[PDB]
């Protein structure tokens with residue numbers, strides 16, 4: 048049971064789903080188009096040891112970022128070359144965390160899957176790493192995990208990067224995501240790293 | 247609300263969902279198995295600059311194609327070696343775009359997720375890059391974005407590559423995908439590159 | 446139509462969905478959290494020729510495994526270095542097959558999508574390769590296809606790796622997965638390689 052344009056528009060109209068900011072032009076037949084924020088995270092450790100707290104760097108782009116596939120083997124020279132040639136603000140290799148501009152709130156009877164736009168998929172750019180499931184009760188922005196798999200990709204601030212596909216629950220959740228004490232990522236105001244060391 | 251074998255068969259029987267060509271043997275408990283077309287696209291530019299129109303090459307296989315992981319570092323020699331050893335028609339590295347044989351039409355009250363078969367997943371071969379969501383109202387073949395993540399994979403023309411998982415909308419869409427002026431990929435007769443420069 | 450915590454708990458309570466072993470603490474708003482088994486598979490051939498039967502190796506971890514991105518270029522020296530530094534049992538590069546601890550049974554009117562936890566997604570670790578769709582009627586453990594896309598990741602035996610998102614069918618399947626003669630992966634007791642050579 049998937050929400051259509053009118054269901055989305057009506058659930059928003061009714062304040063039952065929150066989407067801040069909202070643009071009705073981004074409502075498609077059965078999904079809401081979300082946009083890429085200007086804040087990104089890259090991690091800094093040799094390995095991800097999930098028992099530990101992770102070191103990372105935050106960047107804020109002005110207009111654009113070049114995302115290279117892992118093992119592109121970026122030298123300082125290559126970075127400067129790409130910045131000069133393509134006028135991008137940052138060049139990164141492998142995984143970068145991003146965020147939607149949109150802050151969302153889901154009722155205990157709606158769920159969402161975040162999925163990338165096919166336009167991005169068609170250039171081998173992914174925006175979640177087998178994740179994108181948004182629980183009933185969730186409140187926050189959505190953290191994107193971005194990897195290029197063919198060639199470097201230029202992504203622009205505020206571009207449409209993916210889509211929320213909402214679905215009705217059979218029965219509502221007893222305790223929605225944001226009501227749980229265990230929840231790591233509620234009230235997510237920006238791009239947020241992994242907190243798995245809290246398990 | 248996911249369609250089962252009988253729902254799929256009945257929606258097809260009723261002409262409410264179109265699947266051309268259709269083979270009832272490919273209907274599973276809750277998905278329709280789709281097959282790999284003979285047309286592929288590979289892109290040709292240094293970076294994907296999504297503000298621009300992209301350069302690419304089209305190939306048509308006779309029987310098979312070898313898909314190597316990115317940074318396999320294919321020399322002309324290695325290519326010739328694989329063609330001789332495995333009798334494949336093309337050898338490619340990183341991302342290749344493919345297409346289903348099947349042309350489909352969805353009513354304004356059905357949606358689909360394209361997903362790969364676990365048999366392919368189990369050899370680390372993907373056939374969409376965080377995409378695969380098919381809108382209510384969509385008409386066309388389905389464009390596959392294919393990447394190998396462990397070792398090179400031989401894919402054969404007309405093999406079963408993935409599956410459509412159909413789902414009911416709560417209310418139908420006011421305007422289905424193919425009725426929208428904005429829609430980039432309606433009436434898709436083959437493998438189609440990214441048209442994101444049209445945003 | 447997605448099952449919530451109470452739907453899951455009630456379907457389990459009613460024996461209509463089987464989950465062995467079951468921990469009610471792992472029931473979230475709208476998904477059941479699954480755990481990583483100690484058995485893994487790595488394949489051994491130059492290419493995956495899907496017309497053929499595949500060679501592979503089985504490992505059983507005691508506590509942990511380091512999963513490196515493909516083309517990390519692991520020497521014996523690097524392996525020994527990581528084992529000494531991080532006290533992991535195995536170091537692997539590219540794709541490794543894993544399994545859930547949980548054996549599950551689905552009725553002919555329930556379907557599931559396996560998806561990774563965002564905590565793992567946020568470190569660019571995937572646990573299925575465009576797959577994760579569990580058919581109505583399926584009986585078995587779930588085979589995970591695991592790839593790291595940024596930096597090596599330490600995964601621990603019995604950790605929570607992903608989640609089952611169950612959904613109601615519109616009508617039940619005439620023949621569920623485990624009732625079909627064609628089915629490759631029914632009664633799956635561990636991690637299982639690709640049987641696509643049986644098509």
Ligand SMILES: O=c1ccn([C@H]2C[C@H](O)[C@@H](COP(=O)(O)NP(=O)(O)OP(=O)(O)O)O2)c(=O)[nH]1
Nearest residue numbers: 164165166377378380381384388389429430431
């Ligand atoms: O992986 C996919 C995904 C979608 N499609 C088809 C079905 C879908 O209805 C259509 C567009 O899907 P998206 O909306 O996810 N792509 P995008 O947003 O770039 O195109 P548009 O601006 O036309 O919506 O393309 C494919 O062929 N392959």
Ligand SMILES: O=c1ccn([C@H]2C[C@H](O)[C@@H](COP(=O)(O)NP(=O)(O)OP(=O)(O)O)O2)c(=O)[nH]1
Nearest residue numbers: 363364365576577579580583587588628629630
């Ligand atoms: O990622 C997955 C996906 C599915 N499965 C299980 C559940 C599902 O019912 C079963 C088969 O799924 P697919 O139909 O997607 N695989 P395939 O088409 O290759 O096998 P078959 O020919 O048996 O349908 O394997 C896993 O263990 N891991």
Ligand SMILES: O=c1ccn([C@H]2C[C@H](O)[C@@H](COP(=O)(O)NP(=O)(O)OP(=O)(O)O)O2)c(=O)[nH]1
Nearest residue numbers: 178179181182185189190230231232562563564
């Ligand atoms: O890709 C995603 C997925 C989820 N999310 C949000 C929505 C979801 O409700 C929340 C947690 O999702 P998961 O349960 O899949 N992550 P995890 O299990 O690691 O966190 P927790 O222990 O809090 O459930 O994070 C993102 O921002 N990006």
Ligand SMILES: [Mg+2]
Nearest residue numbers: 075164165210
């Ligand atoms: Mg779209």
Ligand SMILES: [Mg+2]
Nearest residue numbers: 274363364409
């Ligand atoms: Mg199948």
Ligand SMILES: [Mg+2]
Nearest residue numbers: 473562563608
């Ligand atoms: Mg969770």
